[PDB]
Amino acid sequence: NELRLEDNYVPTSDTLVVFKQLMKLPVTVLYDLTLSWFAKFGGSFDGDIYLLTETLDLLIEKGVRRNVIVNRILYVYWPDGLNVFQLAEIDCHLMISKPEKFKWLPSKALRGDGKPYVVKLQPAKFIENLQTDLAKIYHCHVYMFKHPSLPVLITRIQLFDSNKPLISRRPYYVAFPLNSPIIFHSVDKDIYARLVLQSISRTISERETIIFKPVQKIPVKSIHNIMTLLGPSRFAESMGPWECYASANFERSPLHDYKKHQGLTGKKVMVREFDDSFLNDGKEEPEIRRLRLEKNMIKFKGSANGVMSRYSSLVPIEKVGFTLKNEINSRIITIKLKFNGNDIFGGLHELCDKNLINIDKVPGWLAGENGSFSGTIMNGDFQREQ
Amino acid sequence: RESSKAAILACAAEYIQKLKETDEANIEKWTLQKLLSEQNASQLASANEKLQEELGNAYKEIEYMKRVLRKEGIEYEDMHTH
Amino acid sequence: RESSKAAILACAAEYIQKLKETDEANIEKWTLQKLLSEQNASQLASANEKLQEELGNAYKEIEYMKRVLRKEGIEYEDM
Amino acid sequence: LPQMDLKVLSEYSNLRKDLILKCQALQIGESKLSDILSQTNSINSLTTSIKEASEDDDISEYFATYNGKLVVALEEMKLLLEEAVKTFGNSPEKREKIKKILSELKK
Amino acid sequence: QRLQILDDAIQEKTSELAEFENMVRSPSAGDNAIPGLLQIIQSYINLLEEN
Amino acid sequence: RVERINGLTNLQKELVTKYDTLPLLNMNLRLSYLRDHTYPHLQVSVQSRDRVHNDGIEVLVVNYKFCRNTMNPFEIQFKMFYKFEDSTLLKWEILRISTNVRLKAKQLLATRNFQKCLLSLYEFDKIKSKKTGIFQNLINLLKRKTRCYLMNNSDSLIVERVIREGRLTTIKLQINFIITMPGNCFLPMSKISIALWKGGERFNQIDLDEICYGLIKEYGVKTGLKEICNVCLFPDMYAR
Amino acid sequence: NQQIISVRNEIQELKAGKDWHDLQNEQAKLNDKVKLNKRLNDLTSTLLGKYEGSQDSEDDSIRDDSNILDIAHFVDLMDPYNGLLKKINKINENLSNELQ
Amino acid sequence: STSDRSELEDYIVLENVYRMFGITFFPLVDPIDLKIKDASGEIFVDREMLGIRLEVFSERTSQFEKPHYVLLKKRIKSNSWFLFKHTIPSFIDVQGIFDDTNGGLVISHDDAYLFAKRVFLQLVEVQKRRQIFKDLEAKKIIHDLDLDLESSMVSFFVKDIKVELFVKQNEIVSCSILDDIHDFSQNNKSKWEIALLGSLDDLELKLNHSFATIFK
Amino acid sequence: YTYGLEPDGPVTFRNDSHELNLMLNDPIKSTADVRLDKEEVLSLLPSLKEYTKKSKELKETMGQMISDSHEEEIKEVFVPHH
């Protein structure tokens, strides 16, 4: 079954769409890719590497417009078309340049009944098994690249159709952290989404059955942010007001000096009125004003200075919908809250600064605790949505 | 808890079925315990009666020793008194 | 079987509640019977172990009776 | 591996027998080696204690006259207790000796 | 191969046990003196109980 | 208002002005939590706190006492030097060690880590207390029923019962607990074994090991030992 | 292709079923219980003297527990610090201090 | 006065000495659960909370590492703690240990200590393997190596050959040699990985012994 | 516990094992109706027989010194246990 694709196949991709892909990349990165592209597959240029790197250097010297060099690499160097490896390179370089434009969804791997399975991905073995499991059905081509500043291993999978050149489909991205049961994958609902994700579970297991369970239903962009939100890190399960525990800066080492221990110095605090004086309302002292503004930041950022303008939180989230159920007089009272915006917990912080919302009576879940998770709350306990 | 209507209905049906089979398992386990308790009680009663008759035989042997020694005419002492 | 859907849902809720209540009552009565059986077993085992201790004391007595006659040295004829 | 023209049948059956037998020999090898390692730690601790406490790096005479040290200490302890008993009842001394013996029994 | 390496490791350990054994051996005949001292100590304990 | 609080302030005044998730400042409460709950029966005492102004090296002498056993506790003293402004430990040594634990402590103190030594000593003391409690429970259960004596210096227990089916037969059962100090892991460990003699003839060791492992695994240790002491000692009553 | 995906998903769900694992564990536990009960019956019969299976004499030298006990007792007796002679000596000086 | 500074310093010294052990319980209260019964202006907590500190000493660095915090909250309708929040990384399943401990239903500080101990041993296991690998790197018997957050996967060059190891715990459970010198036989490949199989502490002696015979 | 109406045993055992750091001699895994022979296992590792002989010699050696020390007599006359 020779249905797999090598690194030299030339699909009949449109010139306009690949023109717009090179549009977003900066000038300095176009020079780097062109030099590496010729060293692997060559090109239609009638010259050596030294001749190529000479003329390309001169386009930099003259300040040549990028439209000229983009047309040069599309109509002179490779007029016939673009290689699959070149397309993968431009896609990954666009991924690095603009990480906020791509959304991700979390998924959990389980073995046995309820024992989480930490993934240990071999860069080599994970490839050929996936190729074998996918080429028995459809043409398959895969490419792996490691994040320059993150421990993840982003894998892109593209599938080709015969309708003769092959027609490329929308690529599927699956990101593997180093050692974490959570696996982040792109958003897709087609014939290929359930064929690629299912094949990965069989490939990575190799000895026992592994099933994938979606942790969330609302995608979040900024692959950098999702790693802090759900990947292997100290900040997971200690968000919101408890962010001071994630970075143990308030406590010194036992071997450290004991005069700098905050027991001697103490802390500066203000008395909070347990009697309800918020409803009815005098100009506050500037010192009292400063302390009042400090209380709001403590309950939304976790510390007076802030773990992270000032209203931006550590991880912005778009949509979170809570459900509060309480038992009063032997019956259940249900209140449903739905929030929408750019930074939900950042927005609530500003309203508390304008004295619209009492800061003493806001609960933990509204303050940012266990953020990005929406579910029912009972008896002071938070339950995630099934 | 599900927000979807059909999910709620399916979960309700599954819950009703699970309750039915749980009741069946409960009555089966109750019957098993009812058997086990009486079995253990009968075994313990048999053990008690056997050990009691063994004690009776031991007392008979002690009496045999005692009046054998009395026939011998040698003076006797008891360790519960010493 | 009922026609209106609201009656169906109400009957389902009542069915769930009745099943749970019946299960709870059965568990309670079975637990009471278990407690009675355990009490009977314990009260019989106490007498069993007491008479076993008496038997051990009798065995110590008969062992001393056996070792008396060897100290004196008179021959013994078994039954 | 499940057991299963008689050529391969017989040789495969007996070879599977031999290999499962060999691996169970290997795990009882773990048993033997673990026991030996723990016991070696015990014996090495004893010998190094005596070797550091000897100060002359040989203990043959120590083992030889261990018993003699015992008897001489015992019978001089005899005259010590005889003099103490003659001097007084030594109820406090007897209690101290009994407590010391109890501590010795404990550790 | 694995069984062979385990076997000679155990052989080295047995050699160490044998070298330790080759040192403790020594003749002794002080059991009678120890028993006499024990009888004297029993008499001493009886005297102390009297005291 | 604006209030000033520190370690010595009252608990109520600190609770009034509490609006953060940081740990409490009441040093007395923290000390009580660390003493009464985290490490019971551990009498620690900081003997002194000296300084070397030329090099910024702090000298600390700490004395540890374990009081789980009221009689014959074993104490160890530690001396350590660490840099003042930099939380780096230069060196540490043992000033003195109690004689009753020196042998079992030498191989543990050979490793150059104070934390492992303290944890191993505490766990060894706890395991010894648990073993003593188990022995006391078993002795109290089996006393005045069968003739029992304890030897191997509280390491093994021997129970003897005379069982007669027309003739004198004695059943001897030996139960021993072994605590071995590491010197794989760094914590003290325990091992279980049994040995049954029926009138001078020894039983097969494999089947007795299997029965011990079974009964202990499915019944625990406390009830497992009681069940083991029943079946061999009183086989006649269970047979009926 | 749709039925291929459906049947493969059914394969995965059936092979990863919780009830399958529970049944395997139950089978293993019940086999262990049966073996333990058989060995208990054999031991009780051997102790009572009837229906002997072997168990009346030791036949295995691959596991002897008494070695560790013997060497531990020897270590305790031969302690330079906590030995019997050291205890007797300390008794000597304790008595000397008590009666000087 | 200045005396209270003195016994505050003494209390801090004792607290640090306790922190040398590595496992400690510290009080904690959340501001949301504080309410006043208004009987005498008295503030009482509604739901109790307990915190546990875990610190691991690193011999290679001679410094105390960053502490890990795990917090336990008490349920309203039951007398059992539940895992509220923690900072332990994802590769250690704290929730699994919490359910394993006593089959759930933790009620006493003795039971809570056992749970804190079990999660503590795995943290030391991670540090020890990393320390051994870094010691080998310092001794320079092997070339540059890559380590994940648990130091399980590893790959380094001894002389010029790629050798990679998989360790489940302190014992090495797998070996591989991933280079093809054009003098090598397949029989020699098997007899070297099997030898290399063993503990982690004897790797240093074995690397010197096995790789000195090849170049003799 | 298992099939009755009301697992306390296994839970208590796991608690005790994690408390006391207990080891138990794990039986050889299920060999699927394959009997574990002895003499050929011993022959496969003659070092086992060598160690058996050495350990027997060691056990015989310590007994004479233990008897010569007469330590049990002193312990019995000093502190009696019952």
F78 phi and psi angles, rounded to 5 deg: -120, 140
Amino acid at A97: S
Q: How distant is the alpha carbon of residue B26 from its chain centre?
A: 22
Strand partners, H82: H73
Please indicate if any CB of chain D lies within 8 Å of the CB of G80.
yes
Q: How many residues does chain H have?
A: 216
Distance from CA of G16 to the nearest CA of I (A): 24
Place of tokens 């792109």: A186
Task: Please calculate the CA angle A175-A177-A179 and round it to the nearest 5 degrees.
Answer: 150
Report the Cα H70 to chain-centroid distance in Å.
14
CA distance H44 to chain F (A): 9
Residue at token pair 């050699």? E15
Residue H67 to residue H54: CA distance in whole angstroms: 6
Determine the Cα–Cα distance for residues A247 and A364; give it in Å rounded to an integer.
20
The answer to whether H60 and H134 are in contact (CB under 8 A) is yes
Q: What contacts F141, CB < 8 A, 6 or more positions away?
A: F226, F229
Between strands H34-36 and A220-221, the pairing is unpaired
Q: HSE-up of H195 (CA within 13 Å, CB side)?
A: 15
DSSP for A89-100, please give it.
Answer: HHHHHHHHH-GG
Is the Cβ pair A198, G1 closer than 8 Å? no
Buried b (16+ CB within 10 A) or exposed e, B9-24: eeebeeeeeebeeeee
Helix (H), strand (E) at residue D83 = helix D60-87
Selection from G81, F153, F121, F101 nearest residue D102 by Cα: F153
Subunits in contact with chain C (3 or more CB pairs closer than 8 Å): B, F, I
Q: Do B44 and C47 touch (CB under 8 A)?
A: no
CA angle D66, D72, D76 (to 5 degrees): 145
Q: Which residues pair with F172 in a beta bridge?
A: F160, F197
Residues of D in contact with G96 (CB under 8 A): 80
Taking the Cβ of residue B42 and every Cβ of chain C, the question of whether any pair is shorter than 8 Å is answered with no
Distances in whole angstroms, Cα of residue F63 to Cα of each of F57, F83, F119, H17? 20, 21, 15, 10
Distances (CA, A) of A332 to A75, A327, H46: 70, 5, 21
Q: Quick check: D32 and I48 in contact, CB under 8 A? A: yes
Q: What is the dihedral of CA F4, F5, F11, F16, to 10 degrees?
A: 40
d(CA G91, CA G96): 8
- Measured CA to CA, the distance from residue A199 to residue F201 in angstroms comes to 64
Q: Chain G interface, mutation test: which of F170, F204, F215, most G Cβ atoms within 10 Å?
A: F204
Taking the domains of chain H in order of start, what are their residue ranges? 1-212
Question: Which residue, among F106, F37, F42, has the nearest Cα to F69 in the 3D structure?
Answer: F42
Binary contact (F106, D105; C-beta < 8 A): no
Distance separating alpha carbons of residues B55 and B53, to the nearest angstrom? 5
For chain F, the 3-state helix, strand and coil shares in percent, each to the nearest 5, are 35, 35, 30
Q: What does the block give as tokens for H179?
A: 């280079």
* Subunit contact D45:G75, Cβ cutoff 8 A: yes
Strands (E), chain H: 23-27, 34-36, 43-45, 49-54, 57-58, 63-64, 68-74, 81-86, 153-157, 162-167, 172-177
**Alpha carbon of D95 to those of D76, D83, G94, G95: distances in Å?**
20, 17, 11, 11
Which residue pairs, CB below 8 angstroms and at least 24 apart, start in B37-45?
B37/C34, B37/C37, B37/C41, B40/C41, B41/C37, B41/C40, B41/C41, B41/C44, B43/F240, B44/C41, B44/C44, B44/C45, B44/C48, B45/C44
Q: Which residues contact I57 (CB under 8 A, 6 or more apart)?
A: E21
- Could you tell me if F76 and F97 are in contact, meaning their C-beta atoms sit under 8 angstroms apart? yes
Going by the DSSP 8-state scheme, the letter that residue H198 receives in this structure is B
Q: Which residues 44-83 on chain D approach chain E with CB closer than 8 angstroms? A: 47, 59-60, 63-64, 67-68, 70-71, 74-75, 78, 81-82
Q: Which of H100, H103, H114 sits opposite I19 (nearest CB)?
A: H114
Burial label for D46, CB within 10 Å (0-12, 13-18, 19+), is: buried
Q: What's at E33, amino acid-wise?
A: A
CA–CA distance, G37 with G40 (Å, rounded to integer): 5
- How many angstroms separate the CA of residue E26 from the nearest CA in chain D? 7
Q: List % helix, strand, coil for chain I (3-state, nearest 5).
A: 60, 0, 35
Bridge partners (DSSP) listed for residue A105: A185
Q: Distance between CA D4 and CA H189 in Å, rounded? A: 33
Q: Exposed, middle or buried, B34 (CB in 10 Å: 0-12/13-18/19+)?
A: middle
Residue F47, domain extent: 1-237
For residue H64, list its beta bridge partners. Answer: H57
Per-position DSSP letters for F204-227, written without gaps between them = PHHHHHHHHHHHHHHH-SHHHHHH
* Strand intervals (E) in chain A: 103-111, 115-116, 139-146, 153-161, 167-168, 172-176, 182-185, 210-214, 220-221, 267-270, 319-327, 332-340, 376-378, 381-382
The separation between CA B32 and the C-alpha centre of its own chain, rounded to angstroms, equals 14
Q: What is the spatial distance between Cα H21 and Cα F121, in angstroms, rounded to a whole number?
A: 11
Residue H50 neighbours by CB distance under 10 Å? 19
Using CA atoms, how far apart are residues H21 and F42, in angstroms rounded to an integer?
12
Residue A176, beta-bridge partner list: A153
Q: Give CA–CA dist F125/F65, Å, rounded.
A: 11
Q: What distances in angstroms separate CA H127 from CA F121, H134, H147, H149, one per listed residue? A: 22, 10, 12, 10
| Tally of domains within chain F | 1
Tokens of D25: 């020999």
Q: Which two tokens stand for residue E44?
A: 């001493």
Burial class (CB in 10 A: 0-12, 13-18, 19+), A99: middle
Place of tokens 């005419």: B73
**Phi and psi at residue F154, to the nearest 5°:** 60, 30
Compare CB distances from E47 to D36, D37, D85 and report the shortest one's residue. D85
Cβ-Cβ contacts under 8 Å between B and F: the total is 13
Q: Are strands F75-83 and F57-66 parallel, antiparallel or unpaired?
A: antiparallel
What is the CB-side half-sphere exposure of residue A268 using CA atoms within 13 A?
Answer: 9
Shortest Cα distance, chain A CAs vs residue G14, angstroms: 10
For tokens 């009576």, what's the residue? Answer: A361
For residue E50, give how far its alpha carbon lies from the nearest alpha carbon of chain H (Å): 49
**Cα–Cα dist A173/A184, whole Å:** 9
Kindly tell me whether chain G and chain C come into contact, counting contact as 3+ Cβ pairs under 8 Å.
no
CB-based contact, F46 to chain A, within 8 Å: no
Residue H204 exposure: Cα atoms within 13 Å on the Cβ side: 12
- Which residues does chain I have within 8 Å of residue B30's beta carbon, measured at their own beta carbons? 5
From chain H, pick out residues whose CB is under 8 angstroms from the CB of A251: 67
Min distance C61 CA to chain I CA atoms (Å): 19
Q: Where are the alpha helices (DSSP H) in chain C?
A: 5-72
| DSSP summary character for residue G51 | S
Cα–Cα distance for residue pair F184/H15, rounded to 1 Å = 31
**Measuring CA to CA, how many Å separate E24 from each of A149, E17, E32?**
65, 12, 21
Here the contacts of F119-124 (C-beta below 8 Å, separation 24 or greater) are F119/F186, F119/F187, F119/H21, F119/H22, F120/F181, F120/F182, F120/F186, F120/F187, F120/F188, F121/F64, F121/F66, F121/F76, F122/F39, F122/F42, F122/F66, F122/H21, F123/F187, F123/F188, F123/I21, F124/F179, F124/F181, F124/F188
d(CA G49, CA E37): 46
- For chain G, which residues lie within 8 Å of any Cβ of chain F, measuring from their own Cβ? 32, 36, 39-40, 42-44, 46-49, 54-60, 63-66, 68-69, 72-73, 75-76, 79, 81-82
Residues of D62-98 as b/e, b for ≥16 C-beta within 10 angstroms?
ebeebbeebeebbeebeeebeebbeeeebeebbebbe
CA pseudo-torsion sign B20, B24, B30, B33: negative
Q: Is E42:I77 a contact under the CB 8 Å cutoff? A: yes
User: CA I72 → CA F135, G19, H178, distances in Å?
Assistant: 21, 60, 63
**3-state DSSP assignment of residue A234:** coil
Gaps in chain I after residue (C–N beyond 2.5 Å): 6
Could you tell me which of D29, F6, D37, B66 has the C-alpha nearest to residue E17? D37
A369: alpha, beta or left? (left if phi > 0; alpha if psi -120 to 50): beta
Q: Give the integer Cα–Cα distance in Å for G42 and G55.
A: 9
CA angle H202, H208, H214 (to 5 degrees): 130
CA–CA gap between residue A29 and residue A25 (Å, rounded): 7
For the record, the structure tokens of B46 come out as: 């048999």
Cα–Cα distance measured from residue G24 to residue G16, given in angstroms and rounded to the nearest whole number: 12
The tokens for H137 are 């790197």
| Cβ A377 vs Cβ A322: under 8 Å | yes
CA–CA separation, A247 and A243 (whole Å): 7
Is beta strand A376-378 parallel, antiparallel or unpaired with respect to A319-327?
parallel
The continuous run of DSSP H or E covering I69 comes out as helix I46-69
- Is I11's CB within 8 Å of H101's CB? no
Contact A219, A106 (CB under 8 A): no
Calpha distance B50→F17 (Å, rounded): 75
How many angstroms separate the Cα of F93 from the Cα of each of F25, F87, F88, H57?
33, 18, 16, 17
User: Which 3 state secondary structure label does DSSP give A115?
Assistant: strand
| Residue (of H116, H43, H105) closest to H75 by Cα position | H105
For chain E, what is the radius of gyration of the CA atoms?
A: 24
Resolution in Å equals: 3.7
Please count the CA atoms within 13 angstroms of the CA of A287 that sit on its side-chain side.
6
Instruction: Pick the residue from chain H with its C-alpha nearest to F186.
Output: H121
What does the alpha-carbon distance between residue H8 and residue H2 come to, in Å, rounded to a whole number? 10
Compute CA distances H62 → A82, A255, B79, F88, whole Å: 56, 10, 70, 5
CA distances from D103 to A229, D81, F74, F100 (A): 59, 20, 12, 9
Place of tokens 């027609």: A167
- Which among H212, H204, H132, H143 is positioned nearest to H179, based on CA atoms? H143
Work out how many CB contacts closer than 8 A connect A with H: 88
Taking the CA of residue D54 and the nearest CA in chain I, the distance in Å comes to 20
Asked if residue A121 lies in contact with residue A187, where contact means CB atoms within 8 angstroms, the answer is no
Q: How many other C-beta atoms lie within 10 A of the C-beta of residue A373?
A: 20
Q: B-chain residues within 8 Å CB-CB of A383? A: 1
Q: Cα–Cα distances in Å, from C25 out to C19, C28, E14?
A: 10, 5, 67
- Give the DSSP letter string of F97-149: E-GGGHHHHHHHHHSS-HHHHHHHHHHHHHHHHHHHHHHHHHHHHHTTTSEEE
Three-class DSSP category at D14:
helix
Stretch (H or E) spanning F187: none
Q: Whole-angstrom Cα distance, residue G79 to residue G82?
A: 5
Q: Which experiment gave this structure?
A: cryo-EM
Nearest by CB: G40 against F193, F203, F211: F211
Query: Are F31 and F49 contacting, i.e. CB atoms less than 8 angstroms apart?
Result: no
Q: Assign residue A75 a region (left: φ > 0; alpha: ψ between -120 and 50; beta: otherwise).
A: alpha
Supply the DSSP symbol for G54: -
Contact F207 G63 (CB under 8 A): no
Contact residues, chain D, for I41 at CB < 8 Å? 21, 25, 28
Q: In chain A, which residues have their Cβ closer than 8 Å to the Cβ of B2?
A: 386
Cα Rg, chain A, nearest whole Å: 27
